[PDB]
């Protein structure tokens, strides 16, 4: 394609970061094809699915997120500098994740999966939604990997060699882990 047949109808979600127990899709920019839904530029939809016993390693988004439970049952931990706050999503349960707060979403135990609806409200840039991960995995390495060894030596009070060890990684699996136990 290229430029909306008018269309308000939309089935295509690009492949963010899938796996053998995961998924992560981000629906295209409403105003990519069409001139018509202009008021909807600064928003994006991310549909993310996962099997039982799996995690979604901490990362922050630079966007304000509104979360939604389409199918399944979940558990949302939200990490801030003085403690963590823990929630449960269950059917239809909805919650608003505040742009910039690192957070990890899990799906407990059973045999039914998890289906979440992520709705992004964008500030630093319209359309753009960048989720920032702490882990060096197959594809992307960890952001703590973009500073100079000197920064990491200075910052940490450990040796590049101590750092690089709990820095980067094989993350064979990647971003949608399996709930070890």
């Amino acid at each position: 394609a290229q430029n909306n047949p008018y269309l308000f109808r939309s089935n295509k979600f690009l492949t963010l970061f899938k796996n053998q127990h995961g998924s992560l899709r981000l629906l295209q920019r409403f105003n990519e094809d069409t001139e018509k839904l202009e008021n909807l530029r600064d928003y994006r939809v991310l549909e993310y699915c996962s099997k039982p016993n799996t995690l979604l390693l901490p990362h922050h988004s630079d966007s304000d997120l509104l979360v939604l439970v389409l199918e399944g049952q979940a558990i949302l931990v939200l990490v801030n500098p003085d403690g963590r706050d823990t929630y449960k999503l269950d059917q239809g349960d909805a919650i608003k994740i505040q742009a910039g707060t690192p957070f990890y979403l899990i799906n407990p135990d059973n045999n039914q999966n998890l289906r979440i609806l992520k709705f992004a409200i964008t500030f630093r840039r319209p359309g753009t939604v960048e989720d920032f991960f702490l882990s060096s995995t197959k594809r992307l390495p960890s952001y703590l990997s973009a500073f100079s060894k000197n920064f990491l030596e200075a910052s940490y009070d450990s040796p590049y060699d101590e750092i690089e060890q709990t820095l980067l990684q094989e993350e064979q699996e990647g971003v949608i882990v399996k709930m070890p136990k």
Partner: protein, 184 residues
């Protein structure tokens, strides 16, 4: 300043949020400035001595404009920028870093981390936009460090290490925001 204030009145720079022997940071917010409130702007005054390091962090919602007043600063933001990536790809990691000289400006967008090296004794003035509810997260140093709130279960699953092994890395740091980045 004024026998006749009730409008704008003058705002200066009163108590520090982050203070110690490496540096200082003076932020004024909109939550506590009617003038800055109306407008949505936050200000600061970063103080530092040569060899002092301003640990890795990122603002939640504020896009900070860093103005170099007196001094030289090594900067480092780090990024993940575009969207006509889409299917993952393109979306690459950047390290943008520099030397600020007097009158050199640098922009520090909302969810990017950054760390500032103080090659000399240094003064900077920043202007953050969209300052309401700004939070500033730390990923290093003792305090405000978010990578340290994370619990072991997850930690050792996030990181190639082990809950404590990592745990040590995290305690390694005796200090808080400000440090000594002795060469190497």
């Amino acid at each position: 300043t004024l026998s006749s204030q009730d409008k704008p009145f003058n705002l200066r720079s009163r108590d520090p949020i982050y203070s110690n022997n490496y540096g200082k940071l003076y932020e004024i917010t909109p939550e506590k400035n009617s003038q800055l409130r109306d407008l949505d702007i936050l200000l600061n005054c970063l103080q530092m001595n040569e060899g002092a390091l301003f640990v890795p962090h990122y603002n939640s919602r504020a896009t900070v404009i860093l103005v170099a007043n007196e001094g030289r600063a090594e900067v480092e933001l780090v990024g993940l920028e575009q969207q006509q990536q889409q299917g993952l790809e393109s979306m690459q990691l950047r390290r943008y870093a520099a030397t600020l000289s007097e009158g050199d400006i640098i922009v520090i967008p909302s969810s990017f981390p950054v760390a500032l090296k103080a090659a000399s004794d240094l003064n900077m003035v920043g202007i953050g936009v969209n300052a309401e509810n700004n939070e500033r997260n730390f990923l290093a140093g003792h305090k405000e460090n978010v990578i340290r709130q994370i619990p072991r279960q997850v930690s050792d699953l996030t990181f190639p290490g082990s809950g404590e092994e990592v745990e040590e890395l995290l305690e390694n740091q005796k200090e808080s925001y400000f440090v000594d980045g002795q060469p190497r």
